[PDB]
Amino acid sequence: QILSPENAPRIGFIGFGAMASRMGDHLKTAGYTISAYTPSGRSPSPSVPMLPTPLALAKQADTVVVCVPDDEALAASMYGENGALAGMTKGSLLINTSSVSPEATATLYEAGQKHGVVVLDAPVSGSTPEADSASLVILVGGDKDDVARAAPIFDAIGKLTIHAGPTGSGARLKLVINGIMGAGLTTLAESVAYGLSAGLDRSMLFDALDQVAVISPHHKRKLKAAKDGNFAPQFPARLMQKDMRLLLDAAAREAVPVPTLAAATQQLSLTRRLSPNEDYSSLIRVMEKIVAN
Template sequence: MTAAQTIGFIGLGAMASRMAVNLAKAGYKAIAYTPSGKGGNGDIAFLATAADVARAADIVLVCVPDDEALETCMYGAAGALAGMKSGGLVLNTSSVSPEATQALFEAGQKLGVTVIDCPVSGSTPEAEAAALVVLAGGSDDAMQRAKPVFDAIGRLTVHAGPPGSGARLKLVINAIMGAGLAAVAEAIAYGLAAGLDRSMLFDALDEMAVISPHHKRKIRMARTGDFAPQFPARLMQKDMRLFLDAAARLAVPVPTLAATTQQLSLTRRAAEDADYSALIGIMEKIVANDA
């Protein structure tokens, strides 16, 4: 019964903490472990190790920033897999490489544990509103087991295919998102350098159908100079790096996205904890200095 189930969070940052709120509304209980060792989120109990969380939870939900954090939290004597029982379920919402995703799936198989790669599309506003899009890779039976959790945190679940498909689809989506933002930033910089009125330019872009709702939100952030992190630059740059590596392994030429990655590396260097849309502000400062 859903009301009796406990979700064990491995990582409880900006996204996962909002998922936890919506899962509580759906009747789930929560416990957590954070790789940083920091904890204290209302009624959620924080345990000493990921293994402790896995032992006490019915479902383990992983939300960590990168491959390295995933390895630290999932493997070894204190890792979550050490605390899992045969028949357990791991929902890996982390945006990590296809290789790390496959390794975790295979490690789970050896223990009789079902692992679904299910990164989410959306930033903190969508996580708060339970409006994420879940990008899931796994069998049909696994999807049915996870459906109540996915329904509680998102507005849509895309069954991308077999294990590993969710991770790959997430790279595709974030690559498009990053390239779109870079194009917006460069085009705005040209408009400002060419003498267009700033207010007029930002107002006009907000009305254009060619710009996605996501990127319009980023343009509005840039207009006011508020780059509070909905999707931090360090994480977007990491996802672009993962995409480039994955594409190179398949010999897929991606010159546009390679250039975008360089722009986002610049953004990460300048403001790694700011929203990745800070690239718009960086480009604006460059042309302002030339004025």
């Protein structure tokens, strides 16, 4: 039952990008055999065999991990003529680490039920540095017994597994954390922009904010990087802004007013428009440029 390497050695990835490839390396170290599918056929890992379709990927894996950008990519690869779900055996596990909507999560869970496949919604908190060090925090929705089955996989890629509740709970908890992260950055960029506009020395201001208790450790790391103009993508603007769009849609469906998060989303739209592929913290540089002019 437990998906240890002896019981279920073959883990197939649907999607194999910045996070998934780093996850795969820790799973390979833990004793699993890794394979992957991507629409392009390329991936950052040359030694990982590539399968031609999602169906072919699923037909030769014991467990499937999904790590795709959005609802549309998830639907493109799980359903249809060559979709992954129909390639899985009854009683097997699908682990979705993608950041997708509650609706996409419910659709996949239901489709899994029809095929006899248990789908865990297990998005992660942490970016590429945390993927590198296997210090991700797994946010998982599903039955306790199914989370237990996946324990060795979660343990290999992360430092902590939070059982958020039944199916859908992991996806919702991820949306919560994404909103905190996105609005924390827009808040910081706007506050820095006011300080600079009001004449504060840039080097003094960036170093002073490293000393205050009201900024998170994640955002202090972004602020230090931004002092250096370093926006190499850990979490690109295109993905952060998509997560903000998903959160605002979910909050509207629940009829919860979230004006701070809604404002932050618009700032991250501007960030994405100006540079989709650099780190989402580049809004700091955007705001600096506004006040320079």
